[model samples]
Target: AHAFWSTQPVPQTEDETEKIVFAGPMDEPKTVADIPEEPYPIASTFEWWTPNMEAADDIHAIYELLRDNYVEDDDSMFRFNYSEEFLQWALCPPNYIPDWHVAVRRKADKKLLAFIAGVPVTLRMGTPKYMKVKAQEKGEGEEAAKYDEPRHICEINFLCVHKQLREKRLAPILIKEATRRVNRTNVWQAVYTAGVLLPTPYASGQYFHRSLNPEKLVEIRFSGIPAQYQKFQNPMAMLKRNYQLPSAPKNSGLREMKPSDVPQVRRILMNYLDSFDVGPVFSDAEISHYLLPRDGVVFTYVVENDKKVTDFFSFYRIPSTVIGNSNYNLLNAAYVHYYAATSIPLHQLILDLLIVAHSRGFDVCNMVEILDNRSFVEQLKFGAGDGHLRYYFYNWAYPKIKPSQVALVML
Candidate 1:
């Protein structure tokens, strides 16, 4: 499967209308009351690192640790802490709100550990004006506009913590830090994708609370991962390449992105990501950075129609190590992050990108589209058709409970 961007122009909820879907239990929310008065000594204290060029080595070291230690298999495919290029874009992109934080811990032994890191985007960043659209419907257009003002009240786009520290209460600690920053900015609310089985008070019938706009937060489940990945089936072991590259499409309509292309790019991607209906989110600033050739991921390709950008695809050219191989040639594998555009130019746009990739001698190019995207990617040939990839989540709460919510969505 290959990563793809959506072209859905309208916002559609998977569950019900007017109600934003939320997967986890919001049951017993946590508060200051939850923290133990006395605590065990943490051998290591946590610190927040700003994204910078000089931090590249530290960033790569953390990524390598997560990749080498936590990821037990090749097919997990979960990207570790991003490359320095990604960090630069996530933090410095023009449209970004400058709210990224990397929380880490250093032990007495000087070994550093990734505690929590997240990319938060303002409500101004979501599609269908998720924040504004709802506000308008409530006849609070002015209020909605106010909320949308200055790009406050952001969404927690991407976040993760090392597995070894899963139970250390670090998730909430980091969340508090992030929220404190959000408060400092005077943002009134925050939004995020909390999966089912979230440790909210909704599960245990306890009192757990977070300070934010309760009415504004909407939750929805897009799809779920099937149970094949955890069966010890060794999907990659059974994987087979079933298709060769298709003949390249006519290359008459291609162009590289330019400064003026930013808005169009945002328009294209907002529709695309909304259509995919996944948990991950990004702001215009974040996307721009990711789209930059030097600052973020390797996103290079545009399909123009009547001098206007139509179908476009952006792939992240990630350098990865080849398992069980000694040659650096394996270093050329590229991960396809975002591919999207109108159906009219989609095929040609992909062909253009792949052709360029082939010319560059990339070892392999990989992407994953939602299983239901057959309409858009019917031409693609997937091999062995394995089950879904599961994404596990944990919600921080003051009191422990079985689970507040649990959900699965197709990817």
Candidate 2:
């Protein structure tokens, strides 16, 4: 139903149930020679600028634009406020495409306005049956070689336009420009997620929440106790006590992941992700970049037995600004990221995760029903959230996937 999305290469709603004859790019592949060398034209008052994120002032400008104008809930009561350190970690991973971090600014005053970025990722779409068989058939080197290596994709994220410029239809232009840049690299596919429905979605999942600060959530109207509990004089207090978490993690060998654990963590995650219909294929360097713990940005933990790693889990920090709440400016949230479990039960691992998050003072933990998360969410007391995140692929086509088949998690 989106005019802009309709003009793109995505599949339409009618194609949802139709059998896909091909499993890859919808458009014929193009060479770098075929892509335009010059940047697309913009309004006379604005121009494109690739902000050097390494520069403190440049990143701050990007942060300020998003802070005031980025994503908000349906009621505009909350807005995602991504930290500058988190942005740096997300955008500058191994083999990052600098030009993909496209930004726009006013030529007269150099005020940053619109911004979008694409990070390179290798997306694998193998069936669980195929993965199980292939995983047992070969060694790591040979297993990796069997898959198509060059057909990587760009993950589009953090697409934002200044509030004053939304009427100018800058989103489509930014998307097109990013696509052109990616195609020039010979990568013809892109993956992204959005809360709003668009042309079509390959898969869809709902967010789930486990509240840590029930009283604060009540005060901010983020969530509420049952209607039955409303009759009680101290309903808020009852809810807070009910939602309290244990002070410590429950796993035996689990500990904060370290730089030395990168190789082992990568192995476990790769093996685990293969069971899903669609997920990331992480390189060693990319694994380290994403999984290595960064204080107040990301946290990773590993379970060790004897001398080998047995399981891994991680979550990234993302907070929301509580609009009109003078008492609390931020709603600290921890989002579940990549995880792999072989020895520990999924539910127990996640319960431990909640404990750790609560211990660190996060107000809530959010996760989507992707990967093996469904195995643990309900058991761990994660309530179904009102939001739905639909996964989209650009210049690619495939049969619609079930929620349980999805393995990719986007921030």
Candidate 3:
């Protein structure tokens, strides 16, 4: 069914269905020496370039390329306007490899035409099950004991091609080039999320959005009043009234996460992530890099109980471009990233988070239906959106996991 995906190492139905009793890699082990020394050949007019993320010119080129041609709604009314600051934060993280930022440009003028990027991630996917069966079977080597531990993998994002160049078939070329480069580093597995359905997905998450500013969302047709709440008179006024938030946050213990709280937050997060069948394993450096409060980039909060951190949550900003709308330029959006709660109820914590997000002028707050997020999302008046995100693992096979059983979130 999938023309390009049929030849790749990604999961297929007929053979993997009977073989996939558990989560594991599908590709045969290969050393770096076995890989080709030269890069894949592109069209004569285009050339490959590795954008140096640290260089401002390169970063700006990437920013411009994506801001104009990146993700947009099917209706073309809105597009993801990922800020340069956020791109810098996302493209460069702890242990980030320079060569992973792959790009394509014209040979004559050097205009960036296509781009793809990847980051190093120590992801922990799947948990060991059926203890007695495992003991009897005794998997190859001592893999059983190390089955559930974290391993190095690639986390890919920002795949895009110029609007005028889609006919050139650059997607497959870019994907193959990116995969080859990553495999050369000896990391054979990757994880990503897509709004489009491919061959198969390990987990599917439905998006939920809480409108903080109903007027702008309505002005740009980003939201419409659902039937249940349309009671009397003007529906627009009623929506504005219903979506209002408290001036102050609800949780008294909740406050901005500090640098010193990494250890405490790490402990709480590790305990929380271990409860999932699939999730990420963050070291102290990664925890600091991802969870720390970066002004206008990522916002994180921690609840302190007797000076010991007990609960925490984080959200990142990703505004959407308002197309053809003269009144508004962009829609301020916040997405929930990672959270852990020990004492306070999750619903209440999200209430406070919504308050914080609204107070910071976010037009809406979004959360994928994963990792206990369902309990608070529906309770807090978040409307179910039609946008569906499929979580996939490249070169890995899974029997389809539930949203609650998966804990990883993609940017």
Best by lDDT: 3
Report residue 162 deviation for candidate 2 (angstroms): 0.7
| TM per prediction | 0.56, 0.92, 0.94
Tens-digit lDDT string for candidate 2 (1-411): 477976877787746525543345567767889999888888899889999876788888988998899999888999999989888888888999898899989999999989998998888853234334444565433433343443478999999999998878898888888888888888788889999888778788888999988888877878877798888997777887777778988888989998889889988888887677788888889888999999989999888899788987899999999999878999999999998888978888888889999999899999888888888876777898889898888877766777778888887
Cα displacement (angstroms), candidate 2, residue 170, comes to 1.1
Model 2 C-alpha lDDT versus the unseen true structure: 0.83
lDDT of each: 0.42, 0.83, 0.86
Q: Tens digits of per-residue lDDT for model 3 on 183-284?
A: 889888999888988866877888999999999998888987767666777888888888899989878888999999999999999999887877889899
Better TM-score candidate (2, 3):
3
Q: Give the clash total for candidate 2.
A: 0
Candidate 2 pairs with clashing backbones: none
**What are the clash counts of all predictions, listed in order?**
36, 0, 0
Order of candidate numbers by lDDT, starting with the best? 3, 2, 1
Runs of candidate 2 with Cα error greater than 4 angstroms are 126-150, 231-233
Candidate 1's displacement at residue 296, Å, is 8.5
